Write a structure and sequence with these properties.
Radius of gyration of chain E: 20 Å
Chains: A mainly alpha, B mainly alpha, C mainly alpha, D mainly alpha, E mainly alpha, F mainly alpha, G mainly alpha
Subcellular location (chain F): Membrane
Strand content of chain E: under 5%
Shape of chain C: flat
Membrane topology (chain F): Multi-pass membrane protein
Distance between the termini of chain E: 69 Å
Family (chain F): Belongs to the RNase K family.
Number of domains of chain E: 1
Largest interface: C-J, 50 and 48 residues
Structural class of chain C: mainly alpha
Radius of gyration of chain C: 23 Å
Structural class of chain E: mainly alpha
Oligomer: part of a larger assembly
Main location (chain F): membrane
GO molecular function, one term (chain F): RNA endonuclease activity
Largest sheet of chain C: none
């Protein structure tokens, strides 16, 4: 009674959840790393504070990792298709939302870190902005979890 | 039976997702580090 | 050029696939699997008709609107040193509104012909309804695109008119003649669209 | 092509109207004649007030001198340029930056030499040409250390890429200051020209002819002026831009030339230039070659204003107004020194 | 078959409105802010 | 010839390593007449296990030949380093 | 490493402008150990240039008894097939005294038998080593008399890691000794139970419990 | 008797009416705000007047809201397709028309605000040209509304 | 009686709403953060006022979360397809409209924040303009809410 | 009898003729108008001479009109299909040929006006060129008429 | 006996021949006129000689007109298809070959006209090259004539 | 010598590819029930495209890190931390592939 | 028993042979003529002995003409398909190979003539190099001749 090919959707979800969120975190980390290098040569004393955008970027990738595992552990051969579609949507929701978050984290990290090099008071504002990008990633996780368990 | 349904879905789903990866990869591939600060001296 | 590269890559792959599929369907001697009549007849004339209606009006606005900003920026820029400009060169924007109106009237005359069929099996049903459907699509497309490019023409010319008048107030009147030709381009599209749907019926 | 006349007016529509509105304010031949009929500097001021010029010498010293009106004229066009430069977006702003680069190059030549002969930056900046600006630090407070200036330039100053020809500081100390600035400017022309060709629409076709002229015009004058000095023919050739009509074959002849006659023979292959050398009678009481070149350059910059969808209008604007300033100062100077028979040596700008 | 009258008609209308979206977004992406402000 | 003592020294190390490996390998083939199990057997394989033993014996002989060449190489390279 | 040490006096009392040689020389005592342990582990891996070391103790299977177990003239079809050697035929078994039985080095499925070992081994070694690293923190917190860092830090931290990851390690050893081929069908999958553990997922059927 | 998928075309009309109009108004607002930000520094007294381009951009968005809702309230399950394409046409008609108008408002408004600061006599001309832009969006609404009941 | 694979469209809606809204908020956040880092380096006293653009971007993201959840909680297996198209429309309507709002927030935020430091009287105008962008995001939500329950 | 859909191709013919000819005329006119305005600032006495290129462009428009009307008047429901293909070909033939001519008219008119502005003796030369472009357009009409009456 | 739509391929031949050849001549004319307008300023006496590239281009257009008419005259309803493909091939052969020739005419005329003004001895060389471009166009005509009667 | 680290770490991605590519190959037979085939496809793409993302991350930060380190040796610690997170992304790819390919 | 989709493949061979060869020769001619015109400024005495690159370009066009005629003469109605694919291959082989040669002729001709102007010793070298490109084109003819008779 189960339509063959049905698993294709859910399987692409589990992968997409990791792949797209990984690209986001990869952008965030890479973009921040360049800004960090610029700051640190000018002044290395902040080297342990400018790393934060990178840690945040990683958390985004984790959001995707969590969903990718939840989907993979929810695959079966006798899949009812409905659940497979939910898994694809859930995987894309967190993956693509984390992807957007990754760009948000990278762009503001680079600008914030480079600015902080000149103005130490910028640190607090940078963190608050970074918080919004992490929240943007979480919203994706929330929806993905709702769909995958629906 | 219903081939047109599976076909239509899979074609456009994988095409859109594949392109999203290609575009995202392009944007990352060409990330602009700024080419400043220390790059002017290393070049 | 990231977007231009995207557009090109899609363009090339799009047609390259069509070439391979077309030639393959031929080579492998498929039973006329690529059936153009099937496409044209299964697609409801309601799609073709209402598409032409929306295009006729919407494309004309795009033209009008395009031209408006072309001359708007030029007029405002020149006006910094020549405030006289606003007195006369506003007609360029009057021409752009007129270009949009052409499409609006045509779109309504076409839409007034829209009727249900209460039809099912296309075979030997609505033969005339298909003619009217395709004609409405064509006439709508005809006037839409014609007004679209008309609006761009009059916009570009109006820009030159504003830049000329900014420096010499005697030039406006002579240049005005060119915009009149531009407007005529849009009117020609209207004439043909009317003819194309002059003998149609739905229902 | 269909490249311009479509997206161009989206961002650059305002500036095109404004800059041509500014062009309208340039002194006409009728206006220059009214300015000649003065014979007094105060009367010159009064007649200037009839145009877009005027009311800018107010509140200055009661006696008017040539040095004062000269500085003020520069300042007026600098403000107009900076205004248009500030109200602009990257697609156009990069073009304008090249224009400013030409002035930055002269200013950094001024910063060196002074650094090489212990002078403080603060003393040098007041005599830098506007548009150089150098809002960045590190070029400031170099402590009269050549290395600090060469590091600040390499890093912060937009001209860093151009200095790739002249590097390692050793070049700064061993090369003559004039060879350094001519080399740097050549690099500027090469990049700027290529930039204009990347903008492969109306701008390339309207702008490149002007740059190609400048390349060939400098090659001609450089060859002639270099005759009486000590400079290796190969090093002279190194200063010839390759964005011009002499590049394919012709520069080789100028590089070998040791006489004006040979330079003319090179021009003989280019009727557009031959006419300039024949018109430059060069008699003891006539116009010379530099004068004919100025007249030609203005023709080219005026023709730029025949295209309504490009960036070449902004370049031509600056050069035409700069010549306008030269013309006005010339008149003021001829009045002050009472050489009325030499008044008609201004370059008409239509 | 590969396509149905439903599927196809959907794709045909989807592309037209997709082109409109592409046009709109294209101009939105090619939108810049100022490098600097004019004066004090 | 000198060839450079840096390259003669490398030859000595390669030669010594080779002699050790080739002798040990040849023994292994001779004893297990095996893990490698690649003596290039015939496709027309008959019911004769003794045919496999004979193949390994041939492989072993070849191993000692290669070792002999490394012994000659080490000798030459050795004298080069001493003379260099 | 031995060469470098034996020439230590000649290399050290000299000029060595090439930092690459100097670097490895300075680490010569570190490398020496790496070599010594590499031998130890290689012997247990039973890989010496992709060759196993058979000490005449390889008793994984008795081929003569293979043919007895309903395998008569399999070498006829064998010409085109492999045929996997069965577990628990009643005539196979017994561990290799030291390292991996050489027989696997010539199998076409080495890449699954030994691959699984290395995966599970890596987890076992990693988690145990991590627990050691945590244990060390207790001594430091005692030295600096920070009761809070052990009453609210160390204790819940070591329990957290133990409860999740040490549990996993125990199960890995359990499976190896708990299940034989007699239960290979529907044999529990440790990875799935681990994930289901965290999620409190306890299906009625589909997975046997350990 | 209802061709399945009949409802699909209609709902896309409501979507297009809102999404395309929002895109237009969003662009119009972005250009106007950029011009205002650049102008207002030197002549802050013009800030209040300079807002007008932004309001009109907003009106464009409203036209889209009006159609998008009108269509939404006009959807049912047993749609006879004929009605569905009419709603799709109306949606696209106002959508693209509003989209084009938003571009005209943004581009003209940007130039207008900058020009007005330089020459206040241009203020009325700015308003007149911009009214035309809005009238174009209105046109889109008028026809889109007429079609909805045909 | 219900068509198969009918859930696909509604699932894409739920994911589309979240992803496009996150894209919008992410763009608006990144553009504002760049302006903030460039601005507040000279005038840190404004660092706590220039954050607002970013908050509004976050609201765009919430709009998406509200609809994406509303859609997900509305899905079942035996969906009549009609409902799914409605869910897809609601998803896209808010998602793509929020995306447009994101660009409006981003461009105006950057221009406004940097301009504000140059001219503090601009702050109020910046907020008012950004208010229109938030309203553009809301219009999308309004339609999505109308469709999602239709 | 007369097959269905057969008119489809003929309708595209009538549309193609007018639309592509309008494209040609619109481009040629815009290019000439730009050149005319550019010249007229420098010297107005040549303005009348510079108008002809615009008429040239208009003729392209007429070429398209003649065929589009001929076909549109010929179109009926019961078309034998063969006739429709002739109409399709005639439509494209005149439209695309007139399009090419209009492009040529634009380029040479714009360059010709600037040339004449500098050199009045050029007048005859550019007119001869423009005559060739008009001939290029007529060729299109000739073939289209031959096909439309075949 | 013959299949339907068989005239479709043939009629595209008649159209293709005219359109591509007109496009070629249009390009060649446009490029030549640009060179003429720019050159004629300095050397007005050459205006009556520099027109030649334009005439060359017109020949490409005629080449195309001749075949397009021949196809139209030989295009019937009861066509055996075989002949239709031959007509399509003949149409494309002359059209696309003329298009290539028009390009060459264009580039050579543009450079040649300016080169001649700077070098009167180039005039003969310019003609010889343009003769080669006319020969390139003729080859296309020859093949088309062979195919259309085969 | 120190500057090689980005290159050495990057090599892990190719290793991860080998590890999964072999793990999948070990489970390729003719009578595959399709289900397991998709799982293998997903695992292959998951690690591959995730490794691709990680490769980008490592390369970009390596260039900036190595150049910066010569300017300021204190950057060493920060460079290492950044490289780790980029490598983790490749690790996450492996983790999903291992869970999926064995499901 | 002859498949009616064969006369198309065949005739496309004859067309391809001519069209692509003309494109190659046209490109080579366009580039060679441009270089010649520039060269003529300084060295007009070389004009006649600089035409050779253009003649060679023409030979490429002939390569195509010959095959196109041979196929066109071979085309019949009852084609066994096998022959049609040989005609298609032969057409493409000579055409596309000539096209490649046209680029070599063009680029080498331009660089060679410009160099020769300064270094008369380059002339023999220019010819040797261009001879290789003509040989590359001939290779295409050889294969086409083998296929067309197979």
């Amino acid at each position: 009674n189960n339509p063959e090919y049905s698993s294709f959707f859910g399987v692409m979800g589990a992968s997409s959840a990791m792949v797209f969120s990984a690209m986001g975190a990869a952008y965030g980390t890479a973009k921040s790393g360049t800004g960090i290098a610029a700051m640190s040569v000018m002044r290395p004393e902040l080297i342990m504070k400018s790393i934060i955008p990178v840690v945040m970027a990683g958390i985004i990738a984790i959001y995707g990792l969590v969903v990718a595992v939840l989907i993979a552990n929810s695959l079966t051969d006798g899949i009812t298709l409905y659940r497979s579609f939910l898994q694809l949507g859930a995987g894309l929701s967190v993956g693509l939302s984390g992807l957007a978050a990754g760009f948000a984290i990278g762009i503001v990290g680079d600008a914030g870190v480079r600015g902080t090099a000149q103005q130490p008071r910028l640190f607090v504002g940078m963190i608050l902005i970074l918080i919004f990008a992490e929240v943007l990633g979480l919203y994706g996780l929330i929806v993905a979890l709702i769909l995958s368990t629906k | 039976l219903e081939y047109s349904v599976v076909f239509n879905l899979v074609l456009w789903i994988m095409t859109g997702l594949a392109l999203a990866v290609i575009i995202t990869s392009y944007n990352i591939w060409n990330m602009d580090p700024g080419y400043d600060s220390i790059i002017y001296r290393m070049t | 050029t990231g977007l231009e590269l995207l557009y090109l890559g899609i363009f090339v792959a799009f047609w390259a696939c069509m070439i391979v599929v077309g030639i393959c369907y031929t080579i492998f001697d498929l039973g006329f699997r690529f059936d153009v009549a099937w496409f044209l007849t299964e697609t409801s004339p309601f799609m073709w008709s209402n598409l032409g209606i929306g295009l006729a009006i919407s494309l004309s606005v795009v033209g009008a609107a395009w031209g408006i900003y072309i001359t708007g920026s030029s007029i405002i820029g020149g006006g910094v040193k020549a405030p006289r400009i606003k007195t006369k060169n506003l007609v360029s924007i009057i021409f752009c509104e007129a270009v949009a109106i052409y499409g609006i009237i045509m779109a309504i005359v076409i839409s007034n012909m829209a009727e249900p069929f209460s039809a099912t099996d296309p075979k030997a049903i609505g033969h005339r309804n298909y003619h009217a459907g395709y004609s409405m699509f064509g006439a709508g497309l005809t006037v839409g695109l014609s007004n679209l490019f008309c609006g761009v023409c009059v916009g570009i010319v109006g820009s030159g008119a504003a830049l000329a008048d900014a420096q010499n107030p005697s030039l406006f009147v002579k240049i005005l003649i060119v915009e009149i030709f531009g407007s005529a381009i849009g009117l020609f599209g209207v004439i043909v669209a009317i003819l194309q749907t002059s003998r149609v019926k739905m229902g | 092509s269909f490249f311009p006349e479509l997206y161009f007016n989206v961002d650059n529509g305002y500036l095109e109207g404004l800059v041509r509105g500014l062009k309208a304010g340039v002194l006409s031949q009728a206006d220059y004649l009214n300015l000649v009929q003065c014979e007094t500097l105060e009367d010159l001021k009064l007649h200037l007030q009839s145009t877009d010029y005027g009311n800018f010498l107010a509140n200055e010293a009661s006696p008017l001198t040539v040095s004062v009106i000269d500085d003020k004229l520069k300042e007026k066009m600098v403000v107009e340029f900076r205004h248009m430069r500030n109200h602009a977006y990257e697609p156009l702003a990069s073009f304008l930056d090249f224009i400013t680069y030409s002035y930055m190059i002269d200013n950094v030549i001024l910063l060196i030499t002074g650094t090489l002969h212990q002078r403080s930056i603060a003393e040098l900046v007041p005599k830098c040409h506007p548009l150089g600006s150098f809002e960045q630090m590190e070029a400031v407070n170099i402590a009269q250390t050549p290395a600090e200036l060469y590091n600040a330039i390499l890093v912060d100053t937009p001209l860093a890429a151009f200095f790739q020809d002249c590097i390692s500081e050793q070049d700064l100390d061993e090369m003559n200051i004039e060879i350094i600035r001519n080399t740097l400017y050549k690099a500027y022309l090469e990049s700027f020209y290529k930039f204009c060709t990347l903008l492969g629409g109306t701008t390339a076709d309207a702008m490149c002819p002007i740059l190609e002229f400048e390349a060939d015009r400098r090659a001609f004058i450089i060859t002639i002026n270099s005759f009486g000095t000590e400079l290796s023919k190969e090093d002279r050739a190194k200063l010839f831009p390759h964005c011009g009509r002499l590049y394919p074959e012709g520069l080789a002849q100028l590089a070998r030339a040791d006489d004006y006659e040979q330079v003319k023979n090179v021009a003989d292959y280019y009727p557009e230039y031959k006419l300039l050398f024949e018109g430059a009678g060069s008699n003891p009481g006539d116009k010379t070659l530099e004068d004919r070149f100025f007249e030609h350059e203005v023709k080219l910059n005026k023709l730029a204003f025949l295209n309504q969808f490009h960036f070449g209008v902004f370049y031509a604007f600056v050069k035409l107004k700069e010549q306008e300033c030269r013309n006005i100062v010339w008149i003021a100077e001829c009045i002050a020194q009472r050489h009325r028979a030499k008044i008609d040596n201004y370059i008409p700008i239509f | 078959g590969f396509f149905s009258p439903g599927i196809w008609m959907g794709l045909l209308t989807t592309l037209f409105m997709l082109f409109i979206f592409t046009y709109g977004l294209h101009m939105i992406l090619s939108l810049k802010t100022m490098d600097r402000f004019d004066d004090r | 010839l000198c060839c450079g003592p840096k390259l003669a020294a490398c030859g000595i190390v390669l030669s010594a390593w080779g002699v050790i490996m080739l002798i040990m390998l040849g023994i292994f083939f001779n004893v297990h007449s095996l893990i490698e199990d690649v003596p290039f057997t015939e496709k027309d394989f008959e019911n004769g296990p003794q045919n496999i033993y004979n193949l390994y014996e041939q492989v072993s002989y070849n191993c000692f030949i290669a070792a002999g060449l490394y012994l000659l190489l080490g000798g030459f390279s050795f004298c080069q380093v001493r003379l260099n | 490493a031995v060469w470098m040490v034996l020439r230590e006096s000649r290399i050290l009392s000299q000029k060595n402008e090439n930092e690459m040689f100097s670097m490895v020389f300075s680490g010569r005592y570190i490398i020496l150990l790496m070599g010594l342990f590499s031998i130890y582990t290689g012997l247990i891996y039973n890989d010496c240039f992709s060759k196993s070391l058979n000490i005449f103790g390889s008793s994984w299977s008795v081929r003569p008894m293979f043919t007895i177990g309903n395998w008569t003239e399999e070498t006829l079809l064998g010409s085109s097939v492999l045929q996997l050697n069965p577990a628990i035929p009643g005539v196979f078994g017994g561990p290799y005294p030291f390292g991996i039985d050489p027989i696997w080095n010539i199998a076409t499925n080495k890449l699954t038998f030994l691959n699984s070992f290395k995966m599970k081994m890596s987890v076992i070694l990693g988690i145990i080593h991590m627990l050691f690293g945590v244990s060390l923190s207790l001594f430091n917190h005692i030295y600096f008399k920070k009761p809070l860092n052990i009453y609210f830090g160390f204790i819940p931290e070591i329990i957290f890691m133990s409860s999740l990851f040490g549990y996993l390690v125990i199960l890995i050893f359990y499976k190896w000794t708990a299940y034989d081929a007699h239960s290979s069908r529907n044999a529990p999958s440790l990875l799935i139970h681990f994930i289901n553990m965290f999620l409190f997922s306890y299906p009625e059927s589909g997975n046997a419990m350990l």
